[PDB]
Design an enzyme around this catalytic site. Sequence first.
Site, PDB file in Angstrom:
ATOM      1  N   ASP A   1       0.834  -1.226   0.000  1.00 30.73           N
ATOM      2  CA  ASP A   1       0.000   0.000   0.000  1.00 30.73           C
ATOM      3  C   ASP A   1       0.857   1.259   0.000  1.00 30.73           C
ATOM      4  O   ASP A   1       1.312   1.711   1.041  1.00 30.73           O
ATOM      5  CB  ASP A   1      -0.937  -0.017   1.235  1.00 30.73           C
ATOM      6  CG  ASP A   1      -2.007   1.077   1.182  1.00 30.73           C
ATOM      7  OD1 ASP A   1      -1.932   1.964   0.304  1.00 30.73           O
ATOM      8  OD2 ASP A   1      -2.962   1.025   1.994  1.00 30.73           O
ATOM      9  N   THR A   2       1.041   1.850  -1.180  1.00 34.98           N
ATOM     10  CA  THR A   2       1.900   3.038  -1.298  1.00 34.98           C
ATOM     11  C   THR A   2       1.268   4.253  -0.635  1.00 34.98           C
ATOM     12  O   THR A   2       1.934   5.249  -0.360  1.00 34.98           O
ATOM     13  CB  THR A   2       2.229   3.356  -2.750  1.00 34.98           C
ATOM     14  OG1 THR A   2       1.015   3.568  -3.507  1.00 34.98           O
ATOM     15  CG2 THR A   2       2.983   2.166  -3.377  1.00 34.98           C
ATOM     16  N   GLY A   3      -0.039   4.147  -0.383  1.00 30.81           N
ATOM     17  CA  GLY A   3      -0.767   5.208   0.319  1.00 30.81           C
ATOM     18  C   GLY A   3      -0.627   5.204   1.834  1.00 30.81           C
ATOM     19  O   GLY A   3      -1.091   6.151   2.491  1.00 30.81           O
TER      20      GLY A   3
END
Lengths: 99, 99
Positions: free
Chosen positions: B25-27
């Site tokens: 999850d790059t967020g």
Amino acid sequence: PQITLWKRPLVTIKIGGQLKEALLDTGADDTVIEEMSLPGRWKPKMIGGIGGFIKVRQYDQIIIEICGHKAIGTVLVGPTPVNIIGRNLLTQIGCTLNF
Amino acid sequence: PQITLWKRPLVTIKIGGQLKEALLDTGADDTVIEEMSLPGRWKPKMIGGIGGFIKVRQYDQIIIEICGHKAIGTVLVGPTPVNIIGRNLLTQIGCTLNF
Ligand SMILES: [Cl-]
Ligand SMILES: [Cl-]
């Protein structure tokens, strides 16, 4: 480009003739953008929480430019605190995770 | 590997001798993993909502294997509905976004 992850992957996007900052978010299925003007038809959707809480406008076939790469897809427009580029648009620009 | 984004980037991780499914999850700034046993010292933290809502245990210097790549970092352990691999561990494995 290659985007490293030492900082939040916030990038400048161009959408509806406007520049905005948006988070490239592999954890998000969909793309949500803050309130703004977009041309064409839209339909109401309910997002957030259990089975919808906040009303947004779903616009289809919107072109968004992300670091010199155009993507076309559905954008949900409403009072979100952060502009999120989700997988529906990441796939359109051919974005992958690599290690 | 190269991970495409047509489906949610769920991968098998190995942590504390156990296999789990986790979202890359790059967020997410941080990594949160469902309740499990881990050795060593931890300190209590409050996460979620405005200024903390749910109690988790912060474990430092935990080794997690992600698709044959070991990462070392801080993991927050508590009753999360989804295991999240956030940027703190993505950077450790040299993960980048590419398009
Ligand atoms: Cl390029
Ligand atoms: Cl490999």
